[PDB]
Amino acid sequence: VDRSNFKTCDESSFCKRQRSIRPGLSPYRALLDTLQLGPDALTVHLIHEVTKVLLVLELQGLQKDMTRIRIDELEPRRPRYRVPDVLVADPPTARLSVSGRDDNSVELTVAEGPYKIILTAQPFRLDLLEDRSLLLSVNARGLMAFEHQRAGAWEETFKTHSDSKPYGPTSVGLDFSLPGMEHVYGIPEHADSLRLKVTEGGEPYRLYNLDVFQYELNNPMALYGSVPVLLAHSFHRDLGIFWLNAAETWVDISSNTPQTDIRWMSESGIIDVFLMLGPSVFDVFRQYASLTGTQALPPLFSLGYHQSRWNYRDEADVLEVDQGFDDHNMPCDVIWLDIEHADGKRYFTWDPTRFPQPLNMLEHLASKRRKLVAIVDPHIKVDSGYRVHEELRNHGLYVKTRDGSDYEGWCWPGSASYPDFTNPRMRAWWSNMFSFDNYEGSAPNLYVWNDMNEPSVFNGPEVTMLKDAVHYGGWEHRDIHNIYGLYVHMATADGLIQRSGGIERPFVLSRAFFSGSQRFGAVWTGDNTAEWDHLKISIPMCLSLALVGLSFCGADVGGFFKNPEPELLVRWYQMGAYQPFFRAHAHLDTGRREPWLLASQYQDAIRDALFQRYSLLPFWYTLFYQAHKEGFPVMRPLWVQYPEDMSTFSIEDQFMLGDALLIHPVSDAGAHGVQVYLPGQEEVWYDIQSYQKHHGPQTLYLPVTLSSIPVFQRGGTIVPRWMRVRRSSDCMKDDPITLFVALSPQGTAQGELFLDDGHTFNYQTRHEFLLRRFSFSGSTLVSSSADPKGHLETPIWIERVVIMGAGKPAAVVLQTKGSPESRLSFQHDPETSVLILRKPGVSVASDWSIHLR
Amino acid sequence: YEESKPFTCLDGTATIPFDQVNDDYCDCKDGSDEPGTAACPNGSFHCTNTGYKPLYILSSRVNDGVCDCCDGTDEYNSGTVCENTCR
Numbered sequence: 045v046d047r048s049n050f051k052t053c054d055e056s057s058f059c060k061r062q063r064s065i066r067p068g069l070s071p072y073r074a075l076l077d078t079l080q081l082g083p084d085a086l087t088v089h090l091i092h093e094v095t096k097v098l099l100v101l102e103l104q105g106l107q108k109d110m111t112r113i114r115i116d117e118l119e120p121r122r123p124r125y126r127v128p129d130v131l132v133a134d135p136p137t138a139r140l141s142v143s144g145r146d147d148n149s150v151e152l153t154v155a156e157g158p159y160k161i162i163l164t165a166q167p168f169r170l171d172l173l174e175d176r177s178l179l180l181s182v183n184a185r186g187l188m189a190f191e192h193q194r195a196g197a198w199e200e201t202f203k204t205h206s207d208s209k210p211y212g213p214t215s216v217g218l219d220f221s222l223p224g225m226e227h228v229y230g231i232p233e234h235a236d237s238l239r240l241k242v243t244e245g246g247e248p249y250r251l252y253n254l255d256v257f258q259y260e261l262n263n264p265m266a267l268y269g270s271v272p273v274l275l276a277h278s279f280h281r282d283l284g285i286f287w288l289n290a291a292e293t294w295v296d297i298s299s300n301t302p303q304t305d306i307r308w309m310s311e312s313g314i315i316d317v318f319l320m321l322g323p324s325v326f327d328v329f330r331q332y333a334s335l336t337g338t339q340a341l342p343p344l345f346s347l348g349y350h351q352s353r354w355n356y357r358d359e360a361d362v363l364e365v366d367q368g369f370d371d372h373n374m375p376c377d378v379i380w381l382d383i384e385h386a387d388g389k390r391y392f393t394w395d396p397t398r399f400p401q402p403l404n405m406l407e408h409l410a411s412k413r414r415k416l417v418a419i420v421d422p423h424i425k426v427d428s429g430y431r432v433h434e435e436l437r438n439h440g441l442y443v444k445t446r447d448g449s450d451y452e453g454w455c456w457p458g459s460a461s462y463p464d465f466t467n468p469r470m471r472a473w474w475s476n477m478f479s480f481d482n483y484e485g486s487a488p489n490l491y492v493w494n495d496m497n498e499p500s501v502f503n504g505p506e507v508t509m510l511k512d513a514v515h516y517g518g519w520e521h522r523d524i525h526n527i528y529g530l531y532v533h534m535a536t537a538d539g540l541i542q543r544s545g546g547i548e549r550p551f552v553l554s555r556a557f558f559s560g561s562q563r564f565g566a567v568w569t570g571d572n573t574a575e576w577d578h579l580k581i582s583i584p585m586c587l588s589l590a591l592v593g594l595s596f597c598g599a600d601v602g603g604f605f606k607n608p609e610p611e612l613l614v615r616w617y618q619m620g621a622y623q624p625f626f627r628a629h630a631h632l633d634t635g636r637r638e639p640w641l642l643a644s645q646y647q648d649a650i651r652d653a654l655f656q657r658y659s660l661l662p663f664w665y666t667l668f669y670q671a672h673k674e675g676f677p678v679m680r681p682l683w684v685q686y687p688e689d690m691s692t693f694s695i696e697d698q699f700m701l702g703d704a705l706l707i708h709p710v711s712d713a714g715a716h717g718v719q720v721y722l723p724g725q726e727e728v729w730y731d732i733q734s735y736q737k738h739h740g741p742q743t744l745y746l747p748v749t750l751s752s753i754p755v756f757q758r759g760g761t762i763v764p765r766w767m768r769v770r771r772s773s774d775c776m777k778d779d780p781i782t783l784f785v786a787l788s789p790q791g792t793a794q795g796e797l798f799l800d801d802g803h804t805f806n807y808q809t810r811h812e813f814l815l816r817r818f819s820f821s822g823s824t825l826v827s828s829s830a831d832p833k834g835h836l837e838t839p840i841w842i843e844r845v846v847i848m849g850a851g852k853p854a855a856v857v858l859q860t861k862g863s864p865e866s867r868l869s870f871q872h873d874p875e876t877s878v879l880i881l882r883k884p885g886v887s888v889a890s891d892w893s894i895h896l897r
Numbered sequence: 898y899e900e901s902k903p904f905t906c907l908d909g910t911a912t913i914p915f916d917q918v919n920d921d922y923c924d925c926k927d928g929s930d931e932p933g934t935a936a937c938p939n940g941s942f943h944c945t946n947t948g949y950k951p952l953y954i955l956s957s958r959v960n961d962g963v964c965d966c967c968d969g970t971d972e973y974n975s976g977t978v979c980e981n982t983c984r
């Protein structure tokens with residue numbers, strides 16, 4: 045990477061000003077005479093002791109044990125930016141009450157307790173407590189900074205780029221103290237460890253959506269997306285901070301009886317922060333989800349395997365890749381078309397030589413029951429023969445410069461303009477452009493990839509747009525930067541919905557993202573490299589996205605840059621097989637690495653990884669349904685399941701899928717084995733390949749070969765699988781289920797299963813779905829409804845039950861409503877204590893119970 | 898009266914009752930008990946292809962919604978109606 049292209053904090057004038065303020069006595073003071081306790085909020089004036097600037101603090105208690113702090117100028121010259129469209133609703137407030145008062149202090153109670161907020165007047169300070177336990181302090185180190193709008197702090201240059209900065213210094217900043225917290229997580233995206241590092245001896249973590257060519261590992265440089273959410277975990281509690289600001293933001297983290305301090309510094313906008321008080325991390329998940337929404341339920345096919353590269357050259361190449369999967373017995377749902385499929389990178393078009401008949405290509409793919417993804421970027425070639433550019437120019441929908449002309453930068457088609465996606469009129473235009481009459485050559489099995497939406501501008505400062513470009517409503521680009529990509533993602537997803545009459549669920553991959561991006565589809569970690577350390581870092585990077593609500597995450601399988609050695613590609617397939625978004629992708633200058641081009645031993649190990657992923661699709665689908673309804677991450681750090689095991693607080697070579705599967709992919713060339721930490725007091729874990737049972741807590745040395753994927757099922761869980769692997773997920777979605785029951789030491793287990801048609805909103809608009817609960821206790825396995833509202837016509841039935849940790853029964857008896865009592869044959873392996881129940885034959889929609897005698 | 902006999906997997910191994918042939922559950926380790934279903938992972942389905950050359954396909958491609966045999970007989974209960982194209 046070329047670091048000189050990207051500002052350090054010292055080269056960012058507002059970061060330099062803010063960071064030079066060091067912990068000390070704050071000059072800010074609350075004027076308790078101005079205190080007003082309102083219907084929704086408490087409002088009280090603040091004053092800078094030296095400058096006499098007057099600010100308004102708006103303090104709110106919120107339902108679900110959250111607090112919102114907003115600070116703005118009392119009499120501003122012009123309005124400051126408040127982030128729109130990220131919050132799904134106006135958060136329901138709780139009533140505040142003055143329950144104590146001093147000459148320098150006011151104590152507030154949220155509703156009837158137990159949460160209390162202590163406002164200190166001089167110096168300004170806020171403390172949040174549960175009863176009398178101190179949870180969090182605000183401005184405890186006096187780092188609050190609010191540059192009021194006055195009449196490199198003004199005109200500023202970086203390299204050759206000039207920022208006219210017509211409003212001067214307007215940055216805002218605030219610090220937070222977390223007593224008892226030593227481990228913090230989140231604020232993606234950074235190619236760094238899951239547990240965030242202290243920033244004292246170096247750079248703060250930067251949040252600014254940037255296109256970083258050949259980015260490197262273990263550093264705090266800003267990458268393509270920015271989610272200003274930080275989680276703090278201890279043995280005792282979990283907390284979250286949500287800094288709702290869309291401008292360039294730097295985050296300092298400092299340690300100190302143990303206590304972590306957090307400081308946010310943003311270039312403009314107001315101070316708008318949510319404090320999510322837990323106490324458990326799943327409470328924090330719920331609290332954040334109520335604010336910014338939940339993961340959009342992916343259409344089933346998008347959880348299969350995606351085959352991509354830059355570029356498949358023509359229709360014949362696409363069809364040859366499609367046929368190669370079938371000729372080599374490898375499942376695949378989607379083939380991707382990168383930017384060379386269009387006419388000279390004019391998006392929504394097709395190359396007239398290499399893609400002359402897109403409808404026919406899509407028809408051949410539909411006949412294989414596969415899908416296609418086409419890339420559509422938000423930069424529009426300046427070209428009077430290009431209808432998209434002409435309509436956007438004639439309707440004034442482009443981002444503009446200060447002189448009123450449309451902004452023009454450089455990107456893939458050369459000189460390009462940038463639609464103002466912050467303008468709702470532009471988003472409605474963009475959405476309508478995806479209709480089958482407007483996007484000629486598209487079809488219902490074509491989905492979309494949004495790339496370069498930071499936005500990437502090849503000739504712009506830090507390879508993005510000028511700070512003083514002007515958007516809808518007069519706002520500057522510095523005000524809105526980090527939600528530009530989100531708006532592209534949003535407008536694309538809405539277009540795929542509307543083109544179907546509102547019936548089909550969308551699938552959109554996006555590179556840039558913000559808080560709330562989980563509502564619109566998937567993201568990925570951008571342009572990684574075919575190297576073993578990039579394979580390793582895909583876990584903490586996607587783990588950091590999962591913790592802040594973006595569950596549909598992945599990394600380019602095999603690495604984007606360079607050519608992976610066959611052993612590395614095998615390990616990346618095994619790694620990607622157990623990560624949410626599962627796509628192989630590659631740079632223009634790489635060798636072809638479709639999986640059947642390798643020697644047979646590597647092919648076989650890759651095929652085995654693909655088969656495992658496809659068999660687990662009912663499990664992945666259910667985890668994503670739970671994410672969609674509750675806001676719980678699919679891919680989880682071990683400390684989410686074991687909040688009191690302090691030895692898991694930093695683990696990032698292991699992860700869990702839901703609460704049932706623990707994964708430790710091999711991530712070293714020539715490895716002879718791995719060290720697998722199996723946590724949990726009185727917990728047992730089953731090696732899903734050997735069925736060998738293991739008690740926790742322990743660090744197990746597991747020998748591995750090329751085809752090994754170290755995966756363990758937790759006792760007390762039930763995992764559903766489609767053991768009939770077919771060529772795509774559409775082919776499998778009516779097939780029978782096999783249930784894998786891992787018995788706890790108490791002989792119990794539980795699990796869920798979600799089913800629907802696989803691709804429409806009928807689950808929500810018509811309640812056409814099934815949510816089953818499977819529970820085992822004593823010697824009886826019972827299927828019941830976990831949501832009675834859900835009904836679905838489906839041929840899916842239970843063809844097999846595999847029970848781990850069971851003794852040989854004397855007889856097996858099946859009972860279901862509407863049927864006589866039935867007897868089942870079975871197989872029992874005394875060495876492994878594995879019980880296989882043959883062909884139960886019961887509908888998945890029916891209540892039933894199996895009894896082992 | 899006199900009854901009838903059972904089925905033995907072509908790999909020796911085991912012998913199953915005759916009602917477990919093509920009962921949509923895999924009982925033979927070689928897949929030989931399900932020549933007409935998608936139940937076995939290692940089974941094969943025979944396209945007679947009476948108007949052309951016969952063909953074997955994977956059991957996983959029986960009733961997958963995709964036309965694999967030119968005579969269309971691999972899709973008999975999938976919702977995909979395959980036309981005869983052996984010509």
Ligand SMILES: N[C@H]1C[C@](O)(CO)[C@@H](O)[C@H](O)[C@H]1O
Pocket residue numbers: 353354382383419495496555570571604629630631
């Ligand atoms: N670098 C961008 C652009 C790209 O090279 C072609 O559009 C694509 O292949 C990458 O995945 C994306 O990250």
Ligand SMILES: [Ca+2]
Pocket residue numbers: 917918919920921922923924925930931
């Ligand atoms: Ca059978």
Ligand SMILES: [Ca+2]
Pocket residue numbers: 958959960961962963964965966971972
């Ligand atoms: Ca078929």
